[PDB]
Amino acid sequence: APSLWKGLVGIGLFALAHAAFSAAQHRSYMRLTEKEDESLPIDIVLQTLLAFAVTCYGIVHIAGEFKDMDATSELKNKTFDTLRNHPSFYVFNHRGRVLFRPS
Amino acid sequence: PGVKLTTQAYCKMVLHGAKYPHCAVNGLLVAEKQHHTLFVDCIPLFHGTLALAPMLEVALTLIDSWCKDHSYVIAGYYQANERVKDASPNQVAEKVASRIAEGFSDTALIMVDNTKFTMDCVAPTIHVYEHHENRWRCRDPHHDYCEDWPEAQRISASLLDSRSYETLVDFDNHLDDIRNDWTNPEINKAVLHLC
Protein backbone atom coordinates (compact mmCIF):
# COMPACT_ATOMS: atom_id res chain seq x y z
CA ALA A 1 0.00 0.00 0.00
CA PRO A 2 2.69 2.63 0.84
CA SER A 3 4.37 2.00 -2.52
CA LEU A 4 1.15 2.93 -4.33
CA TRP A 5 0.91 6.17 -2.35
CA LYS A 6 4.55 7.00 -3.10
CA GLY A 7 3.98 6.39 -6.81
CA LEU A 8 0.85 8.55 -6.76
CA VAL A 9 2.78 11.36 -5.05
CA GLY A 10 5.52 11.10 -7.67
CA ILE A 11 3.02 11.18 -10.52
CA GLY A 12 1.32 14.23 -9.00
CA LEU A 13 4.66 16.01 -8.65
CA PHE A 14 5.51 15.22 -12.28
CA ALA A 15 2.12 16.57 -13.40
CA LEU A 16 2.72 19.73 -11.37
CA ALA A 17 6.12 20.16 -13.04
CA HIS A 18 4.57 19.68 -16.49
CA ALA A 19 1.92 22.29 -15.69
CA ALA A 20 4.71 24.63 -14.57
CA PHE A 21 6.50 24.10 -17.89
CA SER A 22 3.27 24.80 -19.79
CA ALA A 23 2.74 28.03 -17.82
CA ALA A 24 6.35 29.05 -18.50
CA GLN A 25 5.83 28.50 -22.24
CA HIS A 26 2.61 30.52 -22.07
CA ARG A 27 4.43 33.42 -20.40
CA SER A 28 7.27 33.18 -22.94
CA TYR A 29 4.70 33.51 -25.73
CA MET A 30 3.00 36.39 -23.87
CA ARG A 31 6.28 38.31 -23.75
CA LEU A 32 6.39 38.06 -27.56
CA THR A 33 3.08 39.79 -28.28
CA GLU A 34 2.47 43.44 -27.40
CA LYS A 35 -0.38 44.21 -24.96
CA GLU A 36 -2.93 41.31 -24.99
CA ASP A 37 -3.09 41.30 -21.18
CA GLU A 38 -4.76 37.92 -20.81
CA SER A 39 -4.53 35.26 -18.11
CA LEU A 40 -3.33 31.69 -18.49
CA PRO A 41 -5.99 29.22 -19.71
CA ILE A 42 -8.19 27.63 -17.07
CA ASP A 43 -7.60 24.02 -18.17
CA ILE A 44 -3.95 24.01 -17.08
CA VAL A 45 -4.95 25.85 -13.89
CA LEU A 46 -7.43 23.06 -13.11
CA GLN A 47 -4.80 20.40 -13.89
CA THR A 48 -2.26 22.00 -11.55
CA LEU A 49 -4.91 22.24 -8.82
CA LEU A 50 -5.69 18.55 -9.34
CA ALA A 51 -1.98 17.80 -8.96
CA PHE A 52 -1.94 20.01 -5.83
CA ALA A 53 -4.80 18.05 -4.24
CA VAL A 54 -3.55 14.59 -5.27
CA THR A 55 -0.03 15.00 -3.83
CA CYS A 56 -1.56 16.62 -0.72
CA TYR A 57 -3.46 13.38 -0.03
CA GLY A 58 -0.59 10.87 -0.04
CA ILE A 59 1.76 13.16 1.89
CA VAL A 60 -0.56 12.69 4.87
CA HIS A 61 -0.81 8.90 4.44
CA ILE A 62 2.93 8.27 4.06
CA ALA A 63 3.85 9.35 7.61
CA GLY A 64 1.07 8.06 9.81
CA GLU A 65 2.11 6.62 13.17
CA PHE A 66 -0.49 7.90 15.68
CA LYS A 67 0.67 5.82 18.61
CA ASP A 68 -1.60 5.40 21.63
CA MET A 69 -1.30 7.90 24.48
CA ASP A 70 -1.74 5.23 27.15
CA ALA A 71 1.43 3.31 27.99
CA THR A 72 -0.41 0.53 29.85
CA SER A 73 -1.48 -1.00 26.53
CA GLU A 74 2.14 -1.34 25.38
CA LEU A 75 3.12 -3.40 28.44
CA LYS A 76 -0.20 -5.25 28.18
CA ASN A 77 0.59 -8.33 26.05
CA LYS A 78 4.02 -8.67 27.68
CA THR A 79 4.17 -11.42 30.30
CA PHE A 80 6.17 -11.65 33.52
CA ASP A 81 7.96 -14.74 32.15
CA THR A 82 10.17 -12.64 29.87
CA LEU A 83 10.55 -9.87 32.45
CA ARG A 84 11.87 -12.32 35.07
CA ASN A 85 15.11 -12.89 33.15
CA HIS A 86 17.53 -9.98 32.78
CA PRO A 87 20.41 -9.39 30.34
CA SER A 88 22.66 -8.16 33.15
CA PHE A 89 22.94 -11.13 35.52
CA TYR A 90 23.35 -14.32 33.47
CA VAL A 91 24.58 -17.58 35.02
CA PHE A 92 25.90 -20.16 32.55
CA ASN A 93 25.13 -23.24 34.66
CA HIS A 94 22.30 -25.29 33.15
CA ARG A 95 21.55 -28.90 32.27
CA GLY A 96 20.96 -28.04 28.61
CA ARG A 97 24.61 -27.00 28.33
CA VAL A 98 25.82 -30.51 29.17
CA LEU A 99 22.92 -31.99 27.18
CA PHE A 100 24.02 -30.07 24.07
CA ARG A 101 27.73 -30.65 24.73
CA PRO A 102 28.28 -33.49 22.22
CA SER A 103 26.45 -32.49 18.95
CA PRO B 1 7.68 -51.03 48.65
CA GLY B 2 8.76 -50.94 45.01
CA VAL B 3 8.42 -47.89 42.77
CA LYS B 4 7.24 -48.24 39.17
CA LEU B 5 6.33 -45.63 36.56
CA THR B 6 5.10 -45.66 32.97
CA THR B 7 7.50 -44.43 30.30
CA GLN B 8 4.91 -41.79 29.35
CA ALA B 9 5.31 -40.00 32.69
CA TYR B 10 9.11 -40.19 32.51
CA CYS B 11 9.11 -38.82 28.96
CA LYS B 12 6.80 -35.99 30.03
CA MET B 13 9.08 -35.15 32.97
CA VAL B 14 12.23 -35.21 30.83
CA LEU B 15 10.61 -33.08 28.13
CA HIS B 16 9.33 -30.58 30.70
CA GLY B 17 12.86 -30.30 32.04
CA ALA B 18 14.14 -29.83 28.49
CA LYS B 19 11.60 -27.08 27.74
CA TYR B 20 13.14 -24.83 30.42
CA PRO B 21 16.74 -26.05 30.94
CA HIS B 22 17.74 -22.79 32.68
CA CYS B 23 15.18 -22.52 35.51
CA ALA B 24 13.94 -25.10 37.98
CA VAL B 25 11.08 -27.32 36.85
CA ASN B 26 8.19 -28.79 38.85
CA GLY B 27 5.90 -31.76 38.27
CA LEU B 28 3.11 -33.80 39.83
CA LEU B 29 2.84 -37.56 39.34
CA VAL B 30 -0.58 -39.22 39.33
CA ALA B 31 -1.41 -42.77 40.44
CA GLU B 32 -4.51 -44.96 40.75
CA LYS B 33 -6.05 -45.81 44.13
CA GLN B 34 -8.27 -48.89 44.26
CA HIS B 35 3.25 -53.74 47.61
CA HIS B 36 4.28 -51.67 44.58
CA THR B 37 3.46 -48.07 43.66
CA LEU B 38 2.42 -47.63 40.02
CA PHE B 39 2.48 -44.18 38.41
CA VAL B 40 0.18 -43.25 35.53
CA ASP B 41 1.26 -39.81 34.28
CA CYS B 42 2.70 -36.47 35.34
CA ILE B 43 1.55 -32.87 34.91
CA PRO B 44 4.04 -29.95 34.98
CA LEU B 45 3.14 -27.42 37.67
CA PHE B 46 5.32 -24.31 37.28
CA HIS B 47 8.75 -22.96 36.33
CA GLY B 48 10.92 -19.98 37.22
CA THR B 49 11.08 -18.59 40.76
CA LEU B 50 9.34 -21.75 42.04
CA ALA B 51 8.84 -20.38 45.55
CA LEU B 52 5.16 -19.43 45.62
CA ALA B 53 2.43 -21.40 47.41
CA PRO B 54 -0.79 -19.51 46.47
CA MET B 55 -0.26 -20.29 42.79
CA LEU B 56 0.42 -23.87 43.90
CA GLU B 57 -2.86 -23.50 45.80
CA VAL B 58 -4.87 -23.00 42.60
CA ALA B 59 -2.80 -25.58 40.72
CA LEU B 60 -3.35 -28.29 43.35
CA THR B 61 -7.03 -27.44 43.79
CA LEU B 62 -7.66 -27.76 40.05
CA ILE B 63 -5.60 -30.96 40.08
CA ASP B 64 -7.93 -32.35 42.77
CA SER B 65 -10.95 -31.20 40.75
CA TRP B 66 -9.57 -33.27 37.88
CA CYS B 67 -8.80 -36.34 40.03
CA LYS B 68 -12.38 -36.49 41.38
CA ASP B 69 -13.65 -36.34 37.77
CA HIS B 70 -11.80 -39.35 36.29
CA SER B 71 -11.37 -41.17 39.63
CA TYR B 72 -7.66 -40.51 40.11
CA VAL B 73 -5.36 -39.77 43.05
CA ILE B 74 -2.17 -37.77 43.62
CA ALA B 75 0.86 -39.89 44.47
CA GLY B 76 4.01 -37.75 44.58
CA TYR B 77 5.64 -34.49 43.54
CA TYR B 78 8.94 -34.07 41.69
CA GLN B 79 11.32 -31.13 41.54
CA ALA B 80 14.65 -30.47 39.83
CA ASN B 81 17.21 -27.92 41.02
CA GLU B 82 18.72 -25.17 38.89
CA ARG B 83 22.42 -25.66 39.66
CA VAL B 84 23.99 -28.75 38.11
CA LYS B 85 25.80 -29.63 41.36
CA ASP B 86 22.68 -29.78 43.52
CA ALA B 87 20.75 -32.94 44.41
CA SER B 88 19.17 -32.00 47.75
CA PRO B 89 15.41 -31.48 48.27
CA ASN B 90 14.33 -27.98 49.27
CA GLN B 91 12.12 -26.91 52.17
CA VAL B 92 9.14 -26.15 49.91
CA ALA B 93 9.48 -29.59 48.33
CA GLU B 94 9.39 -31.21 51.77
CA LYS B 95 6.37 -29.10 52.75
CA VAL B 96 4.48 -30.20 49.64
CA ALA B 97 5.54 -33.80 50.29
CA SER B 98 4.11 -33.63 53.82
CA ARG B 99 0.93 -31.98 52.50
CA ILE B 100 0.44 -34.87 50.06
CA ALA B 101 1.44 -37.47 52.69
CA GLU B 102 -1.31 -36.22 55.00
CA GLY B 103 -3.85 -37.58 52.50
CA PHE B 104 -2.02 -40.39 50.71
CA SER B 105 0.10 -42.95 52.57
CA ASP B 106 2.79 -43.16 49.85
CA THR B 107 4.49 -40.06 48.41
CA ALA B 108 7.96 -40.39 46.87
CA LEU B 109 10.01 -37.26 46.13
CA ILE B 110 11.67 -37.35 42.72
CA MET B 111 14.85 -35.30 42.24
CA VAL B 112 15.95 -34.98 38.62
CA ASP B 113 19.72 -34.88 38.25
CA ASN B 114 21.59 -32.42 36.05
CA THR B 115 25.08 -33.93 35.94
CA LYS B 116 24.01 -37.03 33.97
CA PHE B 117 21.49 -35.17 31.77
CA THR B 118 22.56 -35.50 28.13
CA MET B 119 21.25 -36.58 24.73
CA ASP B 120 22.09 -40.28 25.17
CA CYS B 121 20.83 -41.01 28.67
CA VAL B 122 22.12 -44.19 30.29
CA ALA B 123 18.80 -45.19 31.90
CA PRO B 124 17.64 -44.31 35.45
CA THR B 125 19.06 -40.80 36.09
CA ILE B 126 16.44 -40.34 38.81
CA HIS B 127 16.80 -39.81 42.57
CA VAL B 128 13.99 -41.26 44.67
CA TYR B 129 13.68 -39.92 48.22
CA GLU B 130 11.26 -41.43 50.75
CA HIS B 131 10.13 -38.80 53.26
CA HIS B 132 7.52 -38.74 56.02
CA GLU B 133 6.36 -36.55 58.91
CA ASN B 134 9.34 -37.72 61.00
CA ARG B 135 13.09 -37.32 60.36
CA TRP B 136 13.23 -40.33 57.99
CA ARG B 137 14.99 -39.11 54.81
CA CYS B 138 16.41 -42.04 52.81
CA ARG B 139 17.32 -42.21 49.12
CA ASP B 140 17.15 -45.55 47.31
CA PRO B 141 20.60 -46.54 45.96
CA HIS B 142 19.54 -48.13 42.66
CA HIS B 143 16.55 -50.15 41.46
CA ASP B 144 14.34 -50.49 38.36
CA TYR B 145 11.39 -48.10 38.08
CA CYS B 146 10.55 -48.50 34.37
CA GLU B 147 9.15 -51.38 32.34
CA ASP B 148 10.97 -51.55 28.99
CA TRP B 149 14.36 -49.83 29.21
CA PRO B 150 15.45 -50.35 25.55
CA GLU B 151 12.08 -49.27 24.12
CA ALA B 152 11.91 -46.31 26.51
CA GLN B 153 15.42 -45.31 25.44
CA ARG B 154 14.36 -45.49 21.79
CA ILE B 155 11.26 -43.32 22.32
CA SER B 156 13.23 -40.80 24.39
CA ALA B 157 15.93 -40.57 21.72
CA SER B 158 13.33 -40.13 18.97
CA LEU B 159 11.45 -37.47 20.95
CA LEU B 160 14.61 -35.49 21.76
CA ASP B 161 16.13 -35.79 18.28
CA SER B 162 13.03 -34.52 16.48
CA ARG B 163 12.25 -30.95 17.53
CA SER B 164 8.63 -31.64 18.51
CA TYR B 165 8.84 -30.80 22.23
CA GLU B 166 7.79 -27.15 21.88
CA THR B 167 4.12 -28.20 22.02
CA LEU B 168 4.56 -29.12 25.70
CA VAL B 169 2.41 -26.80 27.81
CA ASP B 170 2.51 -25.77 31.47
CA PHE B 171 -0.02 -24.61 34.04
CA ASP B 172 1.39 -21.07 33.76
CA ASN B 173 0.81 -21.18 30.00
CA HIS B 174 -2.78 -22.23 30.73
CA LEU B 175 -3.29 -19.04 32.74
CA ASP B 176 -1.53 -16.96 30.09
CA ASP B 177 -3.12 -18.86 27.17
CA ILE B 178 -6.53 -20.32 28.03
CA ARG B 179 -6.46 -21.91 24.57
CA ASN B 180 -3.68 -24.29 25.57
CA ASP B 181 -4.76 -27.26 27.67
CA TRP B 182 -2.58 -28.99 30.26
CA THR B 183 -3.23 -32.73 29.66
CA ASN B 184 -0.65 -32.99 26.84
CA PRO B 185 -2.88 -34.59 24.16
CA GLU B 186 -0.29 -34.50 21.38
CA ILE B 187 2.30 -36.05 23.72
CA ASN B 188 -0.07 -38.91 24.54
CA LYS B 189 -0.81 -39.51 20.86
CA ALA B 190 2.92 -39.45 20.10
CA VAL B 191 3.87 -41.97 22.80
CA LEU B 192 1.00 -44.25 21.79
CA HIS B 193 2.03 -44.04 18.12
CA LEU B 194 5.71 -44.69 18.84
CA CYS B 195 4.96 -47.94 20.69
Swiss-Prot record, chain A:
GO biological process annotation, one example: magnesium ion transport
Membrane-side (Cytoplasmic) residue stretches: 1-2, 63-103
Membrane association type: Multi-pass membrane protein
Alphabetized UniProt keyword annotations: Endoplasmic reticulum, Endosome, Golgi apparatus, Magnesium, Membrane, Phosphoprotein, Transmembrane, Transmembrane helix, Transport
Lumenal side: 22-42
Location in the cell: Endoplasmic reticulum membrane; Golgi apparatus membrane; Early endosome membrane
Record field: transmembrane: 3-21, 43-62
Gene Ontology molecular function, alphabetical: cobalt ion transmembrane transporter activity; ferrous iron transmembrane transporter activity; inorganic cation transmembrane transporter activity; magnesium ion transmembrane transporter activity
GO cellular component, one term: early endosome membrane
Major place of residence: endoplasmic reticulum
Assembly with partners or alone: Component of the ER membrane protein complex (EMC).
Family: Belongs to the membrane magnesium transporter (TC 1.A.67) family.
The protein's role, per its UniProt record: Part of the endoplasmic reticulum membrane protein complex (EMC) that enables the energy-independent insertion into endoplasmic reticulum membranes of newly synthesized membrane proteins. Preferentially accommodates proteins with transmembrane domains that are weakly hydrophobic or contain destabilizing features such as charged and aromatic residues. Involved in the cotranslational insertion of multi-pass membrane proteins in which stop-transfer membrane-anchor sequences become ER membrane spanning helices.
Name used for this protein in its record: ER membrane protein complex subunit 5
Species this chain originates from: Homo sapiens
Recorded name of the encoding gene: MMGT1
Included stretch of the parent chain: 2 to 104 of 131
Swiss-Prot record, chain B:
Membrane topology label: Peripheral membrane protein
Keywords: Endoplasmic reticulum, Membrane
Record PROSITE patterns: MPN
Bilayer-crossing regions: none
MPN domain span: 3-135
Gene that encodes the chain: EMC8
Top-rank taxon: Eukaryota
Name recorded for this polypeptide: ER membrane protein complex subunit 8
